[PDB]
Design an enzyme around this catalytic site. Structure first.
Site, PDB file in Angstrom:
ATOM      1  N   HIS A  41       0.817  -1.208   0.000  1.00 48.77           N
ATOM      2  CA  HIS A  41       0.000   0.000   0.000  1.00 48.77           C
ATOM      3  C   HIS A  41       0.865   1.280   0.000  1.00 48.77           C
ATOM      4  O   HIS A  41       0.301   2.371  -0.025  1.00 48.77           O
ATOM      5  CB  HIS A  41      -1.100  -0.002   1.070  1.00 48.77           C
ATOM      6  N   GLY A 143       2.427   6.135   9.553  1.00 44.44           N
ATOM      7  CA  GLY A 143       3.847   6.113   9.227  1.00 44.44           C
ATOM      8  C   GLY A 143       4.572   4.894   9.788  1.00 44.44           C
ATOM      9  O   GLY A 143       5.705   4.617   9.382  1.00 44.44           O
ATOM     10  N   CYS A 145       3.657   1.762   9.393  1.00 46.84           N
ATOM     11  CA  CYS A 145       3.546   0.611   8.529  1.00 46.84           C
ATOM     12  C   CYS A 145       4.896   0.234   7.943  1.00 46.84           C
ATOM     13  O   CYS A 145       5.769   1.095   7.784  1.00 46.84           O
ATOM     14  CB  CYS A 145       2.453   0.786   7.486  1.00 46.84           C
TER      15      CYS A 145
HETATM   16  C1  Q7R Z   1       0.550   1.867   9.399  1.00 48.35           C
HETATM   17  C2  Q7R Z   1       0.614   3.127   8.553  1.00 48.35           C
HETATM   18  O1  Q7R Z   1       1.678   3.676   8.313  1.00 48.35           O
HETATM   19  N1  Q7R Z   1      -0.553   3.579   8.052  1.00 48.35           N
HETATM   20  C3  Q7R Z   1      -1.843   2.905   8.191  1.00 48.35           C
HETATM   21  C4  Q7R Z   1      -2.254   2.365   6.844  1.00 48.35           C
HETATM   22  N2  Q7R Z   1      -2.337   3.460   5.854  1.00 48.35           N
HETATM   23  C5  Q7R Z   1      -2.725   2.925   4.525  1.00 48.35           C
HETATM   24  C6  Q7R Z   1      -2.737   4.004   3.443  1.00 48.35           C
HETATM   25  C7  Q7R Z   1      -1.966   3.840   2.296  1.00 48.35           C
HETATM   26  C8  Q7R Z   1      -1.872   4.854   1.356  1.00 48.35           C
HETATM   27  C9  Q7R Z   1      -2.555   6.042   1.542  1.00 48.35           C
HETATM   28  C10 Q7R Z   1      -3.342   6.212   2.665  1.00 48.35           C
HETATM   29  C11 Q7R Z   1      -3.438   5.195   3.609  1.00 48.35           C
HETATM   30  C12 Q7R Z   1      -3.924   1.986   4.607  1.00 48.35           C
HETATM   31  C13 Q7R Z   1      -5.225   2.477   4.623  1.00 48.35           C
HETATM   32  C14 Q7R Z   1      -6.308   1.614   4.688  1.00 48.35           C
HETATM   33  C15 Q7R Z   1      -6.105   0.244   4.748  1.00 48.35           C
HETATM   34  C16 Q7R Z   1      -4.815  -0.259   4.750  1.00 48.35           C
HETATM   35  C17 Q7R Z   1      -3.732   0.606   4.673  1.00 48.35           C
HETATM   36  C18 Q7R Z   1      -1.072   4.219   5.765  1.00 48.35           C
HETATM   37  C19 Q7R Z   1      -0.624   4.713   7.128  1.00 48.35           C
END
Ligand code: Q7R
Ligand code: Q7R
Lengths: 304, 304
Positions: A41, A143, A145
């Site tokens: 992602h 951030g 992830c």
């Molecule tokens: C863990 C982390 O850094 N985040 C949580 C997941 N976010 C995803 C995302 C990716 C790209 C743009 C916006 C959000 C995400 C959203 C929804 C489901 C799975 C992953 C990124 C930040």
């Protein structure tokens, strides 16, 4: 003596953390040899996460669109591929700090350490367990992830988790290092609910053994039980059923303490039926289930 | 989101751990620049610990009697001196992995990470607090002495604790890195009892703020209190008295949540007077006091 929720020393994993940016999305990557692993992602915008078609979104990305930075230096990306829910970015330089490592897919009830990172920089380390519903209860902000979960056997780091998502309930979901999610979760901004978070019975028993080794013995009773009788109570209290395999794994703790496994089960049964009555066990007012029998042995023996 | 007992990443400290042996006594040392710091009881035999005269015991030791091993390589000891309860072993090689560092003496209520080590090798990392009675509740087996406690501010490691002893009650005592014990403890096999282990009120309040930020709000009530009224209840429950300095330190959490400090005090007062009624806060069935207000801010913001 003393018994603490202890994480593995994180140095070997800190040496692998990098920052990965694709467009305006930035998260962590894991650099091992000449490959950087990160959640797929990273290629998505916030609008993409509602219903992403990753194969389609990935066609629009070239090697130069993945910005990989290790500390203050940029790595050259010479290849990219998607394996399940992770991206593997082939870089032109092997990580000089790559430890001996393995990728393992853990079972529910197993514990691991997490090195929470932001922008490829480590912020902290804590101990987790893979819940029986395949979620983890972590501490992950936006951030984080790409931060990973791992175990260490002397000099070998076994990576077992990469963080991908937070469910609407605040619990966490992620994948093993082959990109397969634990449980039924998908990397999409869709409401996904977790199943029953049952208690890891074999871990509670291990922790009760750690308590007796470390001086907390008030809960020991004059009773015994059977697996079948214990399991009727385990079911009532949303505890995982105890099997003969779990009894076998607790054998070393049973031997060390002289307390038969089924006798410890009878103590656990009375604690479930009567509560703690305002008392504590190893400084906890609830039954702790995030120490495996191996964790108790490791901590109580001093393995490095 | 999610809130965990989190330790600092330990890599910078793992690079400083060495093994020190003097005669048949082996423990850990901390190698920074060209000095190895370790507990002075490394010079003692078990018979010596009943009533050691360290200046006298040290006269019989020369530089070649301190065996210092960093990983698999031996360091050459070219000087030795005793500063309070630590020995400083001057070696001929500066530690190439010496981080930017400071030696700090912490206050009761302050938290730090411990890298528990055996034979100069790290086994695990956990988060501690200096208790108001100047003990710490760690996880330390024989051979763990010389393991250190520390905090990190981006790239600077502030060392605050070195482990020396376990009291007959299973609680731990040690020194700062200048060799001064926290509290009244002495490095001698004499029964020394700890004073009252009171609860660090300002940390409990910080953790209640972390709970509200992370979704656990059941304990919020319709009441307020005053410092004096709150402190009557704090005294009754063996909680540290709350001062205006503690209220000031909680200001950022108060601002972020919109919950005035004294209102959070009134929630804490009702929790003390009524208990949790079988409920949990951030997965705990007791009021956690080993997160400082700065720890809550750090974790809730994502500082690396
Ligand atoms: C863990 C982390 O850094 N985040 C949580 C997941 N976010 C995803 C995302 C990716 C790209 C743009 C916006 C959000 C995400 C959203 C929804 C489901 C799975 C992953 C990124 C930040
Ligand atoms: C922490 C650790 O490694 N140990 C606990 C303290 N032991 C001391 C000691 C020193 C030399 C010979 C025997 C025992 C010690 C005993 C009593 C009071 C303070 C320190 C060493 C093992």
């Amino acid at each position: 003596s003393g018994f603490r929720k202890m994480a593995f020393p994180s140095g070997k994993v800190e040496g692998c953390m990098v920052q990965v940016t694709c467009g305006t999305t930035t998260l962590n990557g894991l650099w091992l040899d000449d490959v950087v692993y990160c959640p797929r992602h990273v290629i998505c915008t916030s609008e993409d996460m509602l219903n992403p078609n990753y194969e389609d979104l990935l066609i629009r990305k070239s090697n130069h669109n993945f910005l990989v930075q290790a500390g203050n230096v940029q790595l050259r990306v010479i290849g990219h591929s998607m394996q399940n829910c992770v991206l593997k970015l082939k870089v032109d330089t092997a990580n000089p700090k790559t430890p001996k490592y393995k990728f393992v897919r853990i079972q529910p009830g197993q514990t691991f350490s997490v090195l929470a990172c932001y922008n490829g920089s480590p912020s902290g380390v804590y101990q987790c367990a893979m819940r029986p519903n395949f979620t983890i209860k972590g501490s992950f902000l936006n951030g984080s992830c790409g931060s990973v979960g791992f175990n260490i056997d002397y000099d070998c780091v076994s990576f077992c988790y990469m963080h991908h998502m937070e469910l609407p309930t605040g619990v966490h979901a992620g994948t093993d290092l082959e990109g397969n999610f634990y449980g039924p979760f998908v990397d999409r901004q869709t409401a996904q609910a977790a199943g029953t978070d049952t208690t890891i019975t074999v871990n509670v028993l291990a922790w009760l053994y750690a308590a007796v080794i470390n001086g907390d013995r008030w809960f020991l009773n004059r009773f015994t039980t059977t697996l079948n009788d214990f399991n009727l109570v385990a079911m009532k209290y949303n505890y995982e059923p105890l099997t003969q395999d779990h009894v076998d794994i607790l054998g070393p703790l049973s031997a060390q303490t002289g307390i038969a496994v089924l006798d410890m089960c009878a103590s656990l049964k009375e604690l479930l039926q009567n509560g703690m009555n305002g008392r504590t066990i190893l400084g906890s007012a609830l039954l702790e289930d995030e120490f495996t029998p191996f964790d108790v042995v490791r901590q109580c023996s001093g393995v490095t």
